[PDB]
Amino acid sequence: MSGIALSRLAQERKAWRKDHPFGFVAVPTKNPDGTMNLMNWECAIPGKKGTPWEGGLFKLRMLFKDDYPSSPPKCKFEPPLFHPNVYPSGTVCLSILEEDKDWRPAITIKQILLGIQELLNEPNIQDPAQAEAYTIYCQNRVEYEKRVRAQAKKFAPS
Amino acid sequence: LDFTVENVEKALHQLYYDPNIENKNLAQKWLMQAQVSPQAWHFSWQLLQPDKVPEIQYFGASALHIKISRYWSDIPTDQYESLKAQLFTQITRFASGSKIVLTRLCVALASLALSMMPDAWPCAVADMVRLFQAPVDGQGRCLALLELLTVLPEEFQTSRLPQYRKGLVRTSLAVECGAVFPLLEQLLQQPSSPSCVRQKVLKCFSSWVQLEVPLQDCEALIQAAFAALQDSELFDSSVEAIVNAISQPDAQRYVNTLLKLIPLVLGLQEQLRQAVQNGDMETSHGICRIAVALGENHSRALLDQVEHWQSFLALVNMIMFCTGIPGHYPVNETTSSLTLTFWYTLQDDILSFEAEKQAVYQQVYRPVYFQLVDVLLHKAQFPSDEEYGFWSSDEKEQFRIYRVDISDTLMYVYEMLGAELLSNLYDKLGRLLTSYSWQHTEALLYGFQSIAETIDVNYSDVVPGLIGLIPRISISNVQLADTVMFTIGALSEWLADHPVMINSVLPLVLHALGNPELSVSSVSTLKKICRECKYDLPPYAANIVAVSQDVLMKQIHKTSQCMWLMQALGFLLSALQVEEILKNLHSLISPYIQQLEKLAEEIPNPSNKLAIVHILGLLSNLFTTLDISHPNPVVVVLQQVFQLIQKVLSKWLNDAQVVEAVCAIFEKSVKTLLDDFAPMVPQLCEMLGRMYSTIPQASALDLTRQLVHIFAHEPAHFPPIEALFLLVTSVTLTLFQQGPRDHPDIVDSFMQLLAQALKRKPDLFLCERLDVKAVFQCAVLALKFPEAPTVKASCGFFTELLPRCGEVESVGKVVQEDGRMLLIAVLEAIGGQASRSLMDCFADILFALNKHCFSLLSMWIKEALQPPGFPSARLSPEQKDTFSQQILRERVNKRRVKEMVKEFTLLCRG
């Protein structure tokens, strides 16, 4: 049930603390009680070095349902990003984050985030979540890359 | 429609380039039908043609993967080899073509390979490898062979297969790994292999690493990966390969290999030191992850092998190097945070050992932990005031979370070092004070703060010494100011047992109370000390009350902290003689009763409301903590204030915010006074009835329920409450009729009140002014509300209501007259209209009807189940008769009734 999820999230936290990619950040939020909330994490993914995303730090929220880890968590960029697989709400469209597609209860938080970071540089064309970005990526790649570099600069650290 | 290359290709164009979402979604859904169609086995190969652009080509490749992965039964066994061949050809074709189509065709081939084993394809790896060594240049064929070998494992991981089927595939797959690794080793040891091939090789290695292949088979590749850490281009991949290889669940099965890895880890020390020297954070971060991965995950296993203790100890020091890496976290480095969990593990492992292992290992690591303490306090130290300014909001937050993590680490280091850690702190602080950046002093105190609550009270003679040093610190910064206050608060419980030291810490707290920039920390600490030492703080009560009154008068604290301070005083006064409580209560309230009065005679304003509310809040917060029982100064104060209270109600009887602040003052009073509150009952009921009429609120019902419970036994004082009970019900019932589902909270409280009445004052239902039929109607409808709280409360009412059958005439008539209605609602809930979470609740209503209304229950159930499809369409006539026979048993333990409902509610739902 809910307890099963909470225990597994405590484990994910311990593993993330000891082993996680340079530049990434994944942290649980605190309840109004001041208590720690494992169902809602505040993360930030850095753009892959060597790509137009390089330099940017993109914040996203990870939300867990009480059936975790049976059902994958919902990931959402705050604010929404210019990107083919990212819905305007901010939700990320990724096959491993779909319970009926690839999500395996075994997938870790390090894997999810790395999977999202990869998806940034490489849009999956099998599923459109944003009409314009997804169109510009297929129709005119030069404009796509131009905007993405602007976005990367927009989310540069200060 | 009809799936042809022409039509499928037109749809791809629409999805890819038609800007309009509607269309795209159409094209997507049409393509989803086309990808699974039988025509895919025909048009997918056509979409691979050179004229189709890459993206369009991908759909063809992807559709091929779907048909093999999804419709394997569409292929005959004689066509396996031919199909096999067609895909190898296509992969060779695209080794020089588009990269996306290559991968996609590789996944397709891997799906077919897996479907084939173990028997249909004896040596999937051998065949693949042999064919690529054989049109294309070496690099293109090699990268393609690796792409295929890399995706193979990844497809297995997603292959949804049967325990039986999957085992056979996994088994053959572990055998196939015997051909994969050799190849990978070759490519790395060949100086002719290009950087791009090296990267794919590491990536390939990590893929099979997820399959949990024995750590020993990896020695050759793990050693090569370590060596690749030298090459900047390969760093990322090998760090990930090494960490994953060492982090495998069963990697602990091969302890020997692990020992052999330690030296490979220590060999990185030079590279690590250099990265620190150059400031390259990405690198130290990676090497640290590798070191932490080995030592953190196999600490006890490596400690078990005592003969190698020296090797492990070097590893521990390397980690110590990363924990203390030069610079500030996380601006200058982000590595130290990776090592904190490690120090917990190491310590835990040593305490686990017994006898010689524990004692000898303790002699080895006790000095290592003292060194750590020194390192942790330097890292918990703040950067210079100037440098800190340049930190972003985020960087500051990461350092706050980082300090919290160090506090937990220090709390464990305490359990490893014992009281000698405390003495160590005393010497460091003492030395700094007499032998001077606030940062350095603040960190040392922070050390004490993180350990303060965990300290046993047994080895606390050193603690007094430390308390003494606090009053000698130069509080030059707000950060140091809070730490000092928090430390004092942390020692709150310790002070309650050692009252002499109060004298030393209190002056500091009372002085901080006058500085608004230190409002939150000072008031919380005062509250803690006031809660813990009230019995030893009676002598100082006079000074505390004075400094609190002054501070309030100067608007030094924000409303929320004004309330904390009042709670603090509640505690403090609860410990003084009644005569003293009275002298101070007036000192505290007199100066506000005046402001309230100016305010009561004032014409209502937005600013007028905030002020009136804040003052009432002070009172209710004061009376929450002021329980003299566990004269009546509070009673007198109440009677005196009541006169003013009423004045306020006249102009604000219609304010939601105000009508409740007043309610709160009586709620907290009644909880503190309880029975002694008896004088006020009469006045309070009159005031509550008017309050409730004007503006109904759950809070009022809750206080009414508190009253009924408290004065249910003494008939002397109860008459006024009876009046209030009836009034409140009349009003609630009528408000319920307008929009029953608009006030879940009021309905909830109303149900609780009603149940409380049934439990403690049953006769109340005999009142002629009471509408028993309407109440029963309200409770039955409430059971169907969305909110669990509201339903539980309704169930609770019926639980109490039924046992009163035959005891009170009115309750007997209603259950006989409208009880069928209740039962039907209960079966609707069990049938599925209620959360499964509430089943136990509804079962209670059934048990109650079985025990008290059996003759009626027996009759009602038979009528209510006669209709087919109710309570559920899934229920068979036989099933219904099985349940009714089980429920109509005259003897049953309530524990069994819940079971019957559980079993039944599952059938109704599936």
Q: Are B292 and A125 an interchain contact pair (Cβ–Cβ within 8 Å)?
A: no
Residue A103 distance to chain B (closest CA, Å)? 8
Give the integer Cα–Cα distance in Å for B628 and B675.
Answer: 12
Q: Are A139 and B16 an interchain contact pair (Cβ–Cβ within 8 Å)?
A: yes
Residue pair A58/A130 in contact (Cβ under 8 Å)? The answer is no
Q: How far is residue B767 from each of residues B634, B718, B770, B778, measured CA to CA in Å?
A: 34, 14, 5, 18
Which candidate from B20, B28, B247 shows the least CB-CB separation from A19?
B247
Going by C-alpha positions, the residue among B765, B672, B683 that lies closest to residue B725 is: B765
Residue pair B857/B815 in contact (Cβ under 8 Å)? The answer is no
Whether B305 and chain A come into contact, CB under 8 Å, resolves to no
Beta bridge partners of A45: A58
Give the integer Cα–Cα distance in Å for B669 and B624.
Answer: 7
**R_g of chain B computed on alpha carbons:** 38
Locus of tokens 């002499």 = B500
Neighbours of B313 (CB within 10 A): 15
Give the integer Cα–Cα distance in Å for B347 and B350.
Answer: 5
* Residues of the domain holding B545: 1-910
Q: How far is residue B204 from each of residues B148, B180, B218, B819, measured CA to CA in Å?
A: 9, 9, 13, 71
Which candidate from A22, A138, A158 shows the least CB-CB separation from B16?
A138
Going by C-alpha positions, the residue among B624, B613, B634 that lies closest to residue B571 is: B624
Q: Are B338 and A127 an interchain contact pair (Cβ–Cβ within 8 Å)?
A: no
3-state DSSP assignment of residue B308: helix
Give the integer Cα–Cα distance in Å for A43 and A27.
Answer: 6
What is chain B's percent helix, strand, coil content, to nearest 5? 80, 0, 20
Give the integer Cα–Cα distance in Å for B87 and B103.
Answer: 12
Residue pair B679/B643 in contact (Cβ under 8 Å)? The answer is no
Q: Are A139 and B17 an interchain contact pair (Cβ–Cβ within 8 Å)?
A: yes
Contacts of range B729-733, beta carbons closer than 8 Å, 24 or more positions apart: B729/B754, B729/B770, B729/B771, B729/B775, B730/B769, B730/B771, B731/B692, B731/B693, B731/B696, B732/B696, B732/B701, B733/B771, B733/B774, B733/B775, B733/B778
Whether A14 and chain B come into contact, CB under 8 Å, resolves to yes
* Residues of the domain holding A109: 1-158
Which candidate from B16, B340, B392 shows the least CB-CB separation from A157?
B392
What is the domain-level CATH number for residue A67? 3.10.110.10
Going by C-alpha positions, the residue among B488, B491, B505 that lies closest to residue B457 is: B491
Token readout for B188 is 């790395």
Q: Are B341 and A132 an interchain contact pair (Cβ–Cβ within 8 Å)?
A: no
Give the integer Cα–Cα distance in Å for B349 and B370.
Answer: 17
3-state DSSP assignment of residue A149: helix
Residue pair B897/B850 in contact (Cβ under 8 Å)? The answer is yes
Q: Is A46 left (phi over 0), alpha (psi -120 to 50) or beta?
A: beta
Residue B846 distance to chain A (closest CA, Å)? 27
| DSSP characters over B536-605 | T-TTTHHHHHHHHHHHHHTT-S-HHHHHHHHHHHHHHHHTS-HHHHHHHHHHHHHHHHHHHHHHHSS---
Token readout for B143 is 């990268």
Positive or negative torsion for Cα B455, B461, B467, B469:
negative
Residue A133 distance to chain B (closest CA, Å)? 9
Token readout for B173 is 């797959």
Residue pair A76/A112 in contact (Cβ under 8 Å)? The answer is no
Q: Are A126 and B293 an interchain contact pair (Cβ–Cβ within 8 Å)?
A: no
Give the integer Cα–Cα distance in Å for B738 and B282.
Answer: 66
Residues of B in contact with A14 (CB under 8 A): 341
Question: What is the distance of C-alpha B137 from the center of its chain?
Answer: 54
Whether B58 and chain A come into contact, CB under 8 Å, resolves to yes
Technique used: X-ray
Give the integer Cα–Cα distance in Å for B68 and B48.
Answer: 16
Cis bond before residue B214 (omega within 30° of 0): no
Residues of A in contact with B17 (CB under 8 A): 135, 138-139
Q: How far is residue A150 from each of residues A50, A66, A119, A140, B91, measured CA to CA in Å?
A: 15, 38, 18, 16, 37
Q: Are A18 and B341 an interchain contact pair (Cβ–Cβ within 8 Å)?
A: yes
Locus of tokens 């009136």 = B612
Number of domains in chain B: 1
Token readout for A74 is 């919902």
| DSSP characters over B624-683 | HH--S----HHHHHHHHHHHHHHHHHHHHTT-HHHHHHHHHHHHHHHHHHGGGGGGGHHH
Token readout for B834 is 């209620």
Number of domains in chain A: 1
Nearest CA in chain B to A104: B158
Residue pair B72/B113 in contact (Cβ under 8 Å)? The answer is no
Residue pair B29/B45 in contact (Cβ under 8 Å)? The answer is no
Going by C-alpha positions, the residue among B268, B274, B319 that lies closest to residue B293 is: B319
| DSSP characters over B854-868 | HHHHHHHHHHHHSST
Burial status of residue B601 (CB atoms within 10 A of its CB: 0-12, 13-18, 19 or more) = exposed
Question: What is the distance of C-alpha B103 from the center of its chain?
Answer: 39
3-state DSSP assignment of residue B684: helix
Give the integer Cα–Cα distance in Å for B499 and B122.
Answer: 81
Three-class DSSP labels, B160-228:
CCCHHHHHHHHHHHHHHHHHHHHHHHHHHHCCCCCHHHHHHHHHHHHHHHCCCCCHHHHHHHHHHHHHH
Neighbours of B68 (CB within 10 A): 22
Three-class DSSP labels, B228-252:
HCCCCCCHHHHHHHHHHHHCCHHHH
Going by C-alpha positions, the residue among B761, B654, B750, B760 that lies closest to residue B699 is: B750
Q: Is B149 left (phi over 0), alpha (psi -120 to 50) or beta?
A: alpha
Residue pair B658/B603 in contact (Cβ under 8 Å)? The answer is no
Q: How far is residue B271 from each of residues B288, B291, B318, B641, B693, measured CA to CA in Å?
A: 11, 13, 12, 75, 78
What is chain A's percent helix, strand, coil content, to nearest 5? 35, 20, 45
Question: What is the distance of C-alpha B851 from the center of its chain?
Answer: 43
Q: Are B296 and A27 an interchain contact pair (Cβ–Cβ within 8 Å)?
A: no
Neighbours of B212 (CB within 10 A): 14
Mutate to test the interface with A, among B240, B394, B835, B836 (most CBs of A within 10 A): B394
3-state DSSP assignment of residue A45: strand
Residue pair A149/B49 in contact (Cβ under 8 Å)? The answer is no
Which candidate from B18, B24, B158 shows the least CB-CB separation from A102?
B158
Give the integer Cα–Cα distance in Å for B444 and B330.
Answer: 20
Token readout for B580 is 């003293």
Q: Are B28 and A128 an interchain contact pair (Cβ–Cβ within 8 Å)?
A: yes
Based on the residue annotation, tell me whether A93 is a catalytic residue of this protein. Answer: yes
In the sheet with A36-46, reading across from the earlier edge strand, the strands are A25-30, A36-46, A57-63, A74-77
Contacts of range A60-63, beta carbons closer than 8 Å, 24 or more positions apart: A60/A90, A60/A92, A60/A116, A61/A90, A62/A26, A62/A109, A62/A112, A63/A39
Give the integer Cα–Cα distance in Å for B240 and A148.
Answer: 27
Locus of tokens 């003492």 = B430
**R_g of chain A computed on alpha carbons:** 16
Token readout for B460 is 């606390």
- Between B839-852 and B854-865, two packed helices, what is the crossing angle to 10 degrees? 120
Whether A128 and chain B come into contact, CB under 8 Å, resolves to yes
Whether A125 and chain B come into contact, CB under 8 Å, resolves to yes
Nearest CA in chain B to A14: B341
Mutate to test the interface with A, among B158, B199, B392 (most CBs of A within 10 A): B158
Q: Name the H helices within B247-380.
A: 255-266, 269-278, 281-297, 299-304, 309-323, 340-352, 356-379
Q: Name the H helices within B305-355.
A: 309-323, 340-352
Whether A35 and chain B come into contact, CB under 8 Å, resolves to no
Residue pair B782/B793 in contact (Cβ under 8 Å)? The answer is yes
Q: Is A23 left (phi over 0), alpha (psi -120 to 50) or beta?
A: left
For B132, the enclosing helix (H) or strand (E) is helix B124-133
3-state DSSP assignment of residue B782: helix
Looking at this protein, which amino acid is placed at residue B843?
A
Neighbours of B481 (CB within 10 A): 21
Q: Are B21 and A23 an interchain contact pair (Cβ–Cβ within 8 Å)?
A: no
Q: Is A90 left (phi over 0), alpha (psi -120 to 50) or beta?
A: left
Give the integer Cα–Cα distance in Å for B564 and B530.
Answer: 11
Give first-to-last CA distance, chain A, whole Å.
42
Token readout for B789 is 């709280």
Question: What is the distance of C-alpha B812 from the center of its chain?
Answer: 48
Locus of tokens 């032998």 = B435
Give the integer Cα–Cα distance in Å for B574 and B538.
Answer: 9
Resolution of this PDB entry, in A? Answer: 2.8
Residue A5, C-beta contacts closer than 8 angstroms, at least 6 positions apart = A38, A39, A64, A65, A66, A67, A68, A69
Residue pair B651/B600 in contact (Cβ under 8 Å)? The answer is yes
3-state DSSP assignment of residue B718: coil
Residue A135, C-beta contacts closer than 8 angstroms, at least 6 positions apart = B16, B17, B18, B19
Residue pair B670/B632 in contact (Cβ under 8 Å)? The answer is no
Positive or negative torsion for Cα B326, B328, B334, B339:
positive
Residue B703, C-beta contacts closer than 8 angstroms, at least 6 positions apart = B663, B666, B667, B670, B688
Token readout for B201 is 């090789």
Residue pair B134/B172 in contact (Cβ under 8 Å)? The answer is no
Positive or negative torsion for Cα B46, B48, B49, B52:
positive
CB pairs below 8 Å between A and B: how many? 62
Which candidate from B18, B24, B341 shows the least CB-CB separation from A14?
B341
Nearest 5°: the CA angle B561, B503, B435 is 100
Nearest 5°: the CA angle B23, B28, B30 is 95
Residues of B in contact with A23 (CB under 8 A): 282, 334
Give the integer Cα–Cα distance in Å for B174 and B170.
Answer: 6
Beta bridge partners of A41: A28, A62
Nearest CA in chain A to B28: A127
